[PDB]
């Protein structure tokens, strides 16, 4: 890098935070990581994309030591870039989340009854996570359902209310915001799915370098500036982890019908 900041690739799948404020927040996060980890300022810089399709190019080009990706991107790229976890976020005491399929009250009693019906949600653009992980490989979403992707869970839930959609797959945060019309009910709750945090290329980092970054993130949410960043994303803390935390997901990821 010859004195330039080292790149940290951030593949932001999307979320409650708009792209521009999420990108700014990554820069702010790195400034806190540097302070709490006692790096000189501008040791790192964020290379940000909200496009899943560009994540791979950014990884190959920037050759980053550290990155932030979705679980699906990690599982797909882990072998090529010898990726290992650095930290997971803890949210509401848990390092995992559950997805809920909701539908108008009384219409459907199980997912099998939604076969051939139309599904909405914000995580439908990349349906291998929906099929292999959320549904534990019991359904092939593109074959068994009509996936109507949405960019905002509000849009999907409006369509459900109208009757333009039969059910909506919701994250924890989206399921919490439901209250804020037609009666609805949860038709399906996923198993616990681990949360992604930061990862590292183990061919480009030492174990001790990963540990320093991890420890910095473990203390980030206590910092005056870091606290506001963890609030923005609803994060309780970050926790350092070994690779086995995602081994159960790797088993689901390999399964095919
Ligand atoms: Cl996920």
Author numbering: 22 to 201, 205 to 281
Task: Give the published text.
The aerobic methanotroph Methylococcus capsulatus was the first bacterium shown to synthesize sterols, producing a mixture of C-4 methylated sterols that are distinct from those observed in eukaryotes. C-4 methylated sterols are synthesized in the cytosol and localized to the outer membrane, suggesting that a bacterial sterol transport machinery exists. In this study, we present three putative bacterial sterol transport proteins in M. capsulatus that exhibit remarkable specificity for C-4 methylated sterols. We first used bioinformatics to identify a cytoplasmic membrane protein (BstA), periplasmic protein (BstB), and outer membrane associated protein (BstC).
BstB belongs to a family of periplasmic/substrate binding proteins (SBPs/PBPs) known to traffic bacterial metabolites such as phosphonate. The 1.6 Å-resolution structure of was determined by experimental phasing, producing electron density that allowed the unambiguous building of a model of BstB (except for one disordered loop spanning residues 202–204). The structure comprises two globular α/β domains (domains A and B) that form a cleft at the middle. The domains are connected by two loops: one 9-residue loop that runs from β4 in domain A to β5 in domain B, and a second 8-residue loop that connects β9 in domain B and β10 in domain A. These two long loops could work as a hinge to allow a bending motion of two domains to induce a conformational change upon substrate binding; this is often observed with SBPs/PBPs. The cleft between domains A and B forms a bulky cavity with an area of ~1179.5 Å2 and a volume of ~1009.6 Å3 that extends into domain A and is only accessible to solvent from one side of the structure. The cavity is predominantly hydrophobic, suggesting large and hydrophobic substrates like sterols are favorable for binding. The cleft in BstB is less open (~10 Å) than that in apo-PhnD (~22 Å). One of these patches in the central cleft could be modeled with a chloride ion engaging in polar interactions with the surrounding Glu118, Tyr120, and Phe150. In this docking model, the sterol was positioned in the hydrophobic cavity in domain A with the polar head pointing toward the central cleft and domain B, adjacent to three residues: Glu118, Tyr120, and Asn192. In contrast, the simulation (150 ns) on the MonoC docked complex which had a RMSD of 2.6 Å for the entire length of the trajectory and did not show the same conformational change as the apo-BstB simulation, which supports the idea that the apo-BstB structure represents a ‘partially-open’ form of the protein.
